[PDB]
């Protein structure tokens, strides 16, 4: 846990980083995307309840 | 930048593509008929 | 000859009358929009696509009048 | 607009329908999922 | 307010004016005519209805 | 030229756009960028707490 | 004449009909003669 | 659920069909109804729960369909059989009374009640 | 090559720049330009989620999106004062509507059999006019084929012709003696306002396309 | 010739009929919006009614249009 | 005779003007239906028959008009 | 010549009639606006953009009539 | 003389267009009186809006009038 606290401070894209790098650090990104593309849902459940959706309607 | 993934689209949009072929053929004949004016 | 050309121009003018009904129509849908939205303060998210739909359909009728005007205008 | 009636219609319409198939594939396979990538990446960050 | 059969707590409430009726927001989630004298009548009606309860 | 009148109106239109819209769209974009960043930094805080 | 005063006279009228009890009549009877007050000052006791 | 409520005679506190004479003319409430606020005018009222119908003479009040389908009716007193001959006698007196006799307005209300009585 | 062929190419290259040169190689916070096409994505996502049932909305969501974006760009480029229309070649827009209309009817026929024609008995009504209510529903049902295209086509074509006709009239109006050169700013301002209106109603028409051909698909995908 | 002229005139006249139908479509949609704003929630029940009303109003317009086309083309 | 034949085609057009009225009429019945059903959302089962009757009658006035157009067109 | 030119003038005159419908329409949008704003008060900031939109759309119909008038002249 | 005759006729037809604006103008002002009587105090905000609508409804009639002059004169 000491190591974990230190690890969070010196490695963490707390400004920004390539989202491709986030795919590189977790294949979970590609997994969720692939299942949604395969499903044909473009609705991401709860994306709009913790990020905007900028509706003009 | 661009992530190409396979989307099922052939097995989604098949009646659209079939309709496209019929109208395409019909427009060949229509173009020929309109050039006879 | 002269008569046929004349007739085409006349018929086009007559067709222009048709458009007037669409003119009033668009306003009527929008009037309802305003009245509803003022009633609720908050109906708008459901109502806005409905209002657009009514506008488009009403408008299309006037467009039909217009294209007949063009058909007669050009011949 | 100058030319409204050509007789070059099937020529035109060929390039038109070609553009439709091109854009359809292009959007569907490429450009829609990179927006879905932003959504999921943001949501994954929100989660973790 | 007669809190329990062995207790009483003196209690207060604010009577709703015609002004209250006017500017209450979900008054728009009820429906009556804009030419209704319902604020000016309802104020009076609830002036008494609230008061009678308070007396009781 | 006939069509040069149309080009003058188009120049006026793009001027109105650069006057009004380009700062408005800047502000709109700014607002959203901030929101994304704020969510991001919130999650960063959140996990640092959990460790402690 | 307030809205509830309007209703009041009507209620008072409605209990006279043939069948209606004393307790109703008592609910339509009042012994209070409102002694108007004023800033101390006090306009004399006058029937409510 | 229906609610007829009176400070000392609280009644039906939805019931199938309710027929009301209201400041908005006459209103009938059936199932979900749009949420309204109406001052009830002095009234002859029918409330039907099933096909069975109960007949009320109501002193006016206030009516409010609440969005949760609670028809809050508040009125002072009602119970139309109770209202039923002496009242006609009184109303004759009340007709005399308006001519000389705020009292004028009162007697005018009595005339309104007389119309309601003729309805009975 | 043909002018039309060149402008179909130009549209494709414009659309490519909106999704390649719109973000700095992708970063978490992204870039300002892609926020626009994010909001468009969401307001058309939530629109066809509002229309079409199932997840079949999302199966036709790429189609409804490239029908937005095509019409959105082709009613902006064609409004450039020395640019040669694609949309004012009506044959492409009208054909596209008829293709979609046929692809809805065929999709409906496939999906809901020959009880697809039960769609044209809308509701239980008095029996001697149940067939009447089929006849003057179906007549209007294949009026749906041409209405969708002809709306967009008429608006865009009329916009370009309107601007050009008024430009030609104010050119010969301001040709005369110098008193017309003076105070020829008020008609110029009127033409500028009309030109502002033509961009707006073209972006509205691309949206109107995409709600209306969601409504036709709403009927076709889920009967009644 | 008189007949060819008459076709074009006749066609023009028929086009007038469409105006009423256009107004009609608007009236149904106005009612849709009023109903929805009145209930907050009538929309799903009313939506098939609205489509039905649109279609019937439109049909009368369509008859004007087809008569116009028939006269124009012959 | 060209004059008589013309009179049929012209007269057909004139008849079509009447048809506009029926178009407005149908919509009015529907307008009442929506507002009414909104005002009491349970009135619908009674009202929908009444509405279809009103529609049918309004359409009929249009039909008689359209028939006179068809009489000139096809006989 | 005379007849064709006459017809051009006639066709233009007839075309003015189409405009009237839009004119009545524009008044209706503003009437609704005034009623709405006076009813709500506060709706106005949301409602005014919508009102401008309805106005613009009405105006567009008239513009089509106007260019047909010029063409017929 | 047919062309000259047609100018005078054409002017007449153009005059018809004005009637619609006349009704329209009244409709805006009717709304004004209704609104103002309903609110009392809306007037200071609403009055600029009212004048805008009033002018716009008139303007449609002005176009019809301008065309009348264009025909009449040539």
UniProtKB/Swiss-Prot annotation, chain D:
<dbReference type="GO" id="GO:0015078">
    <property type="term" value="F:proton transmembrane transporter activity"/>
</dbReference>
<keyword id="KW-0496">Mitochondrion</keyword>
<comment type="subunit">
    <text>F-type ATPases have 2 components, CF(1) - the catalytic core - and CF(0) - the membrane proton channel. In yeast, the dimeric form of ATP synthase consists of 17 polypeptides: alpha, beta, gamma, delta, epsilon, 4 (B), 5 (OSCP), 6 (A), 8, 9 (C), d, E (Tim11), f, g, h, i/j and k.</text>
</comment>
<protein>
    <recommendedName>
        <fullName>ATP synthase protein 8</fullName>
    </recommendedName>
</protein>
<keyword id="KW-1133">Transmembrane helix</keyword>
<keyword id="KW-0813">Transport</keyword>
<dbReference type="GO" id="GO:0005739">
    <property type="term" value="C:mitochondrion"/>
</dbReference>
<feature type="transmembrane region" description="Helical">
    <location>
        <begin position="13"/>
        <end position="32"/>
    </location>
</feature>
<dbReference type="GO" id="GO:0015986">
    <property type="term" value="P:proton motive force-driven ATP synthesis"/>
</dbReference>
<comment type="function">
    <text>Mitochondrial membrane ATP synthase (F(1)F(0) ATP synthase or Complex V) produces ATP from ADP in the presence of a proton gradient across the membrane which is generated by electron transport complexes of the respiratory chain. F-type ATPases consist of two structural domains, F(1) - containing the extramembraneous catalytic core and F(0) - containing the membrane proton channel, linked together by a central stalk and a peripheral stalk. During catalysis, ATP synthesis in the catalytic domain of F(1) is coupled via a rotary mechanism of the central stalk subunits to proton translocation.</text>
</comment>
<comment type="similarity">
    <text>Belongs to the ATPase protein 8 family.</text>
</comment>
<keyword id="KW-0066">ATP synthesis</keyword>
Swiss-Prot record, chain E:
<comment type="similarity">
    <text>Belongs to the ATPase gamma chain family.</text>
</comment>
<comment type="function">
    <text>Mitochondrial membrane ATP synthase (F(1)F(0) ATP synthase or Complex V) produces ATP from ADP in the presence of a proton gradient across the membrane which is generated by electron transport complexes of the respiratory chain. F-type ATPases consist of two structural domains, F(1) - containing the extramembraneous catalytic core, and F(0) - containing the membrane proton channel, linked together by a central stalk and a peripheral stalk. During catalysis, ATP synthesis in the catalytic domain of F(1) is coupled via a rotary mechanism of the central stalk subunits to proton translocation.</text>
</comment>
<comment type="subunit">
    <text>F-type ATPases have 2 components, CF(1) - the catalytic core - and CF(0) - the membrane proton channel. CF(1) has five subunits: alpha(3), beta(3), gamma(1), delta(1), epsilon(1). CF(0) has three main subunits: a, b and c.</text>
</comment>
<protein>
    <recommendedName>
        <fullName>ATP synthase subunit gamma, mitochondrial</fullName>
    </recommendedName>
</protein>
UniProtKB/Swiss-Prot annotation, chain G:
<keyword id="KW-0999">Mitochondrion inner membrane</keyword>
<keyword id="KW-0375">Hydrogen ion transport</keyword>
<protein>
    <recommendedName>
        <fullName>ATP synthase subunit epsilon, mitochondrial</fullName>
    </recommendedName>
</protein>
<keyword id="KW-0597">Phosphoprotein</keyword>
<dbReference type="GO" id="GO:0005743">
    <property type="term" value="C:mitochondrial inner membrane"/>
</dbReference>
<keyword id="KW-0472">Membrane</keyword>
<keyword id="KW-0066">ATP synthesis</keyword>
<dbReference type="GO" id="GO:0046933">
    <property type="term" value="F:proton-transporting ATP synthase activity, rotational mechanism"/>
</dbReference>
<keyword id="KW-0496">Mitochondrion</keyword>
<dbReference type="GO" id="GO:0045259">
    <property type="term" value="C:proton-transporting ATP synthase complex"/>
</dbReference>
<keyword id="KW-0406">Ion transport</keyword>
<dbReference type="InterPro" id="IPR006721">
    <property type="entry name" value="ATP_synth_F1_esu_mt"/>
</dbReference>
From Swiss-Prot, chain I:
<keyword id="KW-0375">Hydrogen ion transport</keyword>
<dbReference type="GO" id="GO:0015986">
    <property type="term" value="P:proton motive force-driven ATP synthesis"/>
</dbReference>
<protein>
    <recommendedName>
        <fullName>ATP synthase subunit a</fullName>
    </recommendedName>
</protein>
<dbReference type="Pfam" id="PF00119">
    <property type="entry name" value="ATP-synt_A"/>
</dbReference>
<keyword id="KW-0999">Mitochondrion inner membrane</keyword>
<dbReference type="GO" id="GO:0005739">
    <property type="term" value="C:mitochondrion"/>
</dbReference>
<keyword id="KW-0138">CF(0)</keyword>
<dbReference type="InterPro" id="IPR023011">
    <property type="entry name" value="ATP_synth_F0_asu_AS"/>
</dbReference>
<dbReference type="GO" id="GO:0005743">
    <property type="term" value="C:mitochondrial inner membrane"/>
</dbReference>
<keyword id="KW-0812">Transmembrane</keyword>
<feature type="transmembrane region" description="Helical">
    <location>
        <begin position="57"/>
        <end position="77"/>
    </location>
</feature>
<feature type="transmembrane region" description="Helical">
    <location>
        <begin position="1"/>
        <end position="21"/>
    </location>
</feature>
């Amino acid at each position: 846990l000491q190591s974990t606290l230190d690890n969070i401070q010196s490695a963490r894209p707390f400004d920004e980083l390539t989202v491709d790098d986030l795919t590189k650090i977790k294949p979970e990104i590609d997994a969720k995307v692939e299942e949604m593309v395969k499903k044909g849902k473009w609705d991401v459940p709860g994306y709009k309840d913790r990020f905007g959706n900028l509706n003009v309607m | 930048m661009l992530k190409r993934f396979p989307t099922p689209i052939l097995k989604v949009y098949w009646p659209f593509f079939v309709a496209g072929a019929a109208v395409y053929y019909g427009m060949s004949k229509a173009a020929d008929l309109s050039s006879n004016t | 000859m002269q008569l046929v050309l004349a007739a085409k121009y006349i018929g086009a003018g007559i067709s222009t009358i048709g458009l007037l009904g669409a003119g009033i129509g668009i306003a009527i849908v929008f009037a309802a929009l305003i009245n509803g939205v003022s009633r609720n303060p908050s109906i708008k998210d459901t109502v806005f696509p409905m209002a657009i739909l009514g506008f488009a359909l009403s408008e299309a009728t006037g467009l039909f009048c217009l294209m007949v005007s063009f058909l007669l205008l050009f011949g | 607009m100058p030319q409204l009636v050509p007789f070059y219609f099937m020529n035109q319409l060929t390039y038109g329908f070609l553009l439709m198939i091109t854009l359809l594939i292009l959007f569907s396979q490429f450009f829609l999922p990179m927006i879905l990538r932003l959504y999921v990446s943001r949501l994954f960050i929100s989660k973790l | 307010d007669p809190v329990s059969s062995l207790s009483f707590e003196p209690s207060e409430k604010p009577i709703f004016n015609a002004k209250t009726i006017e500017q209450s927001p979900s008054f728009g989630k009820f429906e009556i005519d804009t030419d209704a004298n319902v604020p000016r009548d309802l104020f009076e009606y609830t002036l008494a209805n609230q008061m009678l309860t308070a007396m009781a | 030229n006939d069509e040069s009148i149309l080009l003058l109106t188009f120049l006026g239109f793009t001027g109105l756009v650069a006057k009004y819209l380009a700062p408005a769209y800047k502000d709109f974009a700014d607002a959203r960028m901030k929101k994304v960043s704020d969510v991001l930094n919130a999650s960063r805080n959140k996990h640092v707490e959990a460790v402690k | 004449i307030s809205y509830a005063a309007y209703l009041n006279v009507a209620a008072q009228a409605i209990r006279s009909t043939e069948l209606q009890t004393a307790s109703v009549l008592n609910r339509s009877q009042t012994d209070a003669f409102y002694t108007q007050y004023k800033n101390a000052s006090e306009p004399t006791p006058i029937t409510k | 659920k229906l609610q007829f409520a009176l400070p000392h005679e609280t009644l039906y506190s939805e019931v199938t069909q309710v027929n009301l004479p209201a400041k908005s003319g006459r209103i009938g409430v059936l199932a979900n109804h749009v949420p309204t606020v109406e001052q009830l005018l002095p009234g002859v009222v029918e409330v039907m729960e099933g096909s069975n119908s109960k007949k009320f003479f109501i002193s006016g009040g206030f009516a409010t369909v609440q969005p949760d389908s609670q028809l809050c009716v508040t009125a002072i007193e009602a119970p139309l059989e109770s209202f039923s001959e002496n009242i006609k006698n009184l109303l004759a007196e009340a007709k005399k009374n308006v001519s000389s006799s705020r009292e004028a307005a009162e007697a005018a209300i009595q005339v309104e009640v007389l119309e309601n009585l003729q309805s009975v | 090559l043909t002018t039309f062929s060149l402008y179909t190419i130009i549209v494709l290259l414009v659309i490519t720049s909106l999704y390649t040169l719109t973000n700095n190689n992708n970063k978490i916070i992204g870039s300002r330009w892609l926020i626009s096409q994010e909001a468009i994505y969401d307001t058309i996502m939530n629109m066809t989620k509002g229309q079409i049932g199932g997840k079949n909305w999302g199966l036709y969501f790429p189609m409804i999106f490239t029908l937005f974006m095509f019409i959105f760009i082709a009613n902006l480029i064609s409004m450039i004062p020395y640019s040669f229309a694609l949309s004012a070649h009506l044959v492409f827009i009208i054909s596209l509507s008829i293709v979609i209309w046929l692809g809805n009817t065929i999709l409906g026929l496939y999906k809901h059999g020959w009880v697809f024609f039960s769609l044209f008995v809308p509701a239980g009504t008095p029996l001697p006019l149940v067939p009447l209510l089929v006849i003057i529903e179906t007549l209007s049902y294949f009026a749906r084929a041409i209405s969708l295209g002809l709306r967009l086509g008429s608006n865009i074509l009329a916009g370009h012709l309107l601007m050009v006709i008024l430009a030609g009239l104010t050119f010969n109006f301001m040709l005369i003696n110098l008193f017309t050169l003076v105070f020829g700013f008020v008609p110029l301002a009127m033409i500028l306002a009309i030109m502002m209106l033509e961009f707006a109603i073209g972006i509205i028409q691309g949206y109107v396309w995409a709600i209306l051909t969601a409504s036709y698909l709403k009927d076709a995908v889920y009967l009644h």
